[PDB]
Amino acid sequence: GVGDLIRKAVSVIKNIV
Amino acid sequence: GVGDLIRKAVSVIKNIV
Numbered sequence: 001g002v003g004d005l006i007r008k009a010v011s012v013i014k015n016i017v
Numbered sequence: 018g019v020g021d022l023i024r025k026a027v028s029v030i031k032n033i034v
């Protein structure tokens with residue numbers, strides 16, 4: 001769902017650097 | 018350079034939802 005999409009997005013952002 | 022790509026990626030992520 002959208003909730004998990006945004007949860008995953010935070011994970012991506014935390015690994016992006 | 019590379020940093021602008023990472024910054025743009027964060028914007029991209031923020032415009033999915």
Ligand SMILES: [K+]
Binds near residue numbers: 024
């Ligand atoms: K930028």
Ligand SMILES: [K+]
Binds near residue numbers: 031032033034
């Ligand atoms: K959005």
